Write a protein that binds this ligand. Structure first.
Ligand code: HEM
Ligand code: HEM
Lengths: 394, 394
């Protein structure tokens, strides 16, 4: 008597469990138990992961349904799970997506200036430095304040919500609601603030008073701010942190990218491909009986799309664990998802990582871990895998 | 084929593994493998734990011997493992121990004022609060600056060394030496600083220039500062943090202690007894062949004294998992060790916890976790078990 295989497998973000490949080979769709006690189907091949993400009958929205089998507890109101649908329904999708590209004048220069300041401060203070708490996350937080059009000084408090907001918990989290409600009131005030005229919130603030959006709720406008700040900051800060580990562990690659920084975009795409920051499969609920591989998934069942399942699939990415800058299919990974809910911040995510890495390699060409890799403390029961601190020297 | 039982068993500090009692019953001394790959004897009964700690032929000093089986890598120079011997040999033991009692005029008032300020700040900011990073540790750090006689503003930088200095690592940790060397230079400067006239460092500074200590090394004086600050802050901050979890989880006890705070000392003694903050057994190396229970420990072998083994031993503490304020043997636990290396800060440790708890209960009588207990992130490969954050509401 063993128990049903539990997910997630490991909170360690520096290496993929040997188990994933064994599972992909033996049973690329298989039954697992989540932290709530619910059963789910874990999908781990590139082929099946793509099938599920490209079939909307595997629904994101319906994961929020009362009584559904759950990966984890909601940390937002249930309607907010369909945030992107809600945005599209309100006629705001084009405007939202336009505000969060890396293309606004001054944005990239702001990113570089900010990275360089953070780095200069670390160099002035002397090794060891914490690249997560004192570089990657602050860079993410600064970026998103700028992208939203909100004061830099407001970023830290919003950031402080995230260690709870992105928990992956069996049970509802009282602190999540306290912080959610507070952050919503914050964004509501931002929309009322005549001095906020730039970024996403500046644009939302104008659309809010345009007749074509008079019946769009103030709740939805505030929700867009909280949701995009949170997803953006947690996703970019965590990706960059774990990408830095991948790089640091590859001195040859570090030197190549330092010597030839025009390769940094190709480097970042591979670092995205091999990234283990998403802690759990992407959840979807079946709205029909659907054949996936050898399993007939039944209506009402939960499906988890394991991104590293797809991204380390040797059928699609030969020598999957190696960073190779000359692959013929380099953006075909699932780091940003696929299909209806493909990441709307993908360009911005790329640029944050590319600029952060460029700046780091320039300032700290000798960057290395200052502790044995095993000494990193991996955050548990969270929607990302991240080291609590990332101590480096240079 | 299983492997040899590995230690430590769990980094979770909120509950003792069912395994410990099974082990204590079946094999209260048994072979284990440490994180270095070394074999060791894990001792887990009150009787055998006391036997080992009271027999100096199980040596602390000799754990630092080149080529010995190791629990973990040294994070200090090897001579520093015998710090207390070194202090006693230099004629400084009485003076050191006198400076770190809770008895200096103003000290306890300082502790209370500090706790109350920290708490007021949390209340002003609003729930949720992090009781580790924003109460217990800062209280510990403030206390030890005061005890040492050094500026409060110097505490945070010294504190920042500790997440690495008290790692429990398989391998040497480069950052540990960087920080050690820096902190030693700091304490050396303190001894040269004419404005430092109080506390432990004020007293050491005077003894340093007294003829009776002219041939005591400046290295040893600086080492006393780094070592006592580190052990003190990590031990009190971590104990208080985990004691707060124990209390919060016991609303009846929380209310009793709030209503009748004269019971807080008895409460703190039980919280000490059941505390799981020490992450690993206390290491000793056998300097002779010695019978321990059914095992003849051989010269050169490593022995690990599992404090919760002793402290949850139902033979000595009936109903060991229950906090009972009327036990007939309440201080007979091993939270502060036993024998030659009994904690020299035990009184101070008690008072820090008693004052912190009194202040918390007064200010936050409604204190409760703001997240499900399972959502706490337990620090790994560290010499203490502690949650990275302790989110509360009240
Ligand atoms: C390297 C950085 C990033 C990575 C790796 C990443 C990854 C992802 C992934 C895998 C999804 C799909 C989730 C699903 O299908 O269940 C997603 C969606 C999303 N992302 Fe990103 N993301 C990043 C950056 C950003 C940024 C910068 C923002 C906003 C400023 C953002 C906002 C969002 C939002 C709002 C969704 C939900 C899309 C939907 O539900 O339709 N992300 N992201
Ligand atoms: C609740 C607070 C504390 C707890 C639970 C605690 C626990 C312990 C334990 C179990 C030992 C024995 C280690 C061994 O035998 O291997 C010890 C030793 C020691 N403690 Fe504490 N301690 C606390 C507070 C303090 C404070 C406040 C200081 C100093 C200001 C301190 C300084 C030391 C030192 C220097 C040793 C080494 C003793 C030796 O090697 O002879 N501790 N502590």
């Amino acid at each position: 008597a063993t128990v049903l295989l539990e997910v997630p497998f490991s909170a360690r973000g520096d290496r993929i469990p040997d188990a994933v490949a064994e599972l992909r080979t033996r049973e690329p769709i298989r039954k697992v138990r989540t932290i709530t006690g619910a059963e789910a189907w874990l999908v781990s091949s590139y082929a099946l992961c793509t099938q599920v993400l490209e079939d909307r009958r595997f629904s994101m929205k319906e994961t929020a349904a009362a009584g559904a089998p759950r990966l984890n507890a909601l940390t937002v109101p249930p309607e907010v799970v369909n945030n992107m649908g809600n945005i599209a329904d309100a006629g705001l999708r084009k405007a939202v997506m336009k505000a969060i590209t890396p293309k606004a004048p001054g944005l990239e220069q702001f990113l570089r200036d900010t990275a360089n300041s953070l780095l200069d401060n670390l160099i002035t203070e002397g090794a060891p430095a914490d690249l997560r708490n004192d570089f990657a996350d602050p860079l993410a937080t600064a970026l998103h304040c700028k992208v939203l059009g909100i004061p830099q000084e407001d970023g830290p408090k919003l950031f402080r919500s995230l260690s709870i907001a992105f928990m992956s918990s069996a049970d509802p989290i009282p602190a999540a609601k306290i912080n959610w409600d507070r952050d919503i009131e914050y964004m509501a005030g931002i929309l009322e603030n005549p001095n906020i005229t730039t970024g996403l919130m500046g644009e939302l603030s104008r659309l809010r008073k345009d007749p074509a959006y008079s019946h769009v709720s103030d709740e939805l406008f505030a929700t867009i701010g909280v949701t995009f700040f949170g997803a953006g900051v947690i996703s970019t800060g965590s990706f960059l942190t774990t990408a830095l580990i991948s790089l640091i562990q590859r001195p040859q690659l570090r030197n190549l990218l330092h010597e030839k920084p025009e390769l940094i975009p190709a480097g970042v795409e591979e670092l995205l491909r091999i990234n283990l920051a998403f802690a759990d499969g992407l959840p979807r609920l079946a709205t029909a009986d659907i054949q996936v591989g050898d399993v007939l998934v039944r209506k009402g069942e939960l499906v988890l799309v394991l991104l590293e399942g797809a991204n380390f699939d040797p059928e699609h990415f030969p020598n999957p664990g190696s960073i190779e800058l000359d692959r013929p299919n380099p953006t075909s990974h699932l780091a940003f998802g696929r299909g209806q809910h493909f990441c709307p911040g993908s360009a911005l995510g790329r640029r944050h990582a590319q600029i952060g890495i460029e700046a780091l390699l320039k300032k700290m060409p000798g960057v290395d871990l200052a502790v044995p890799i095993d000494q990193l403390v991996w955050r548990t029961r969270f929607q990302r895998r991240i080291p609590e601190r990332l101590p480096v020297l240079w």
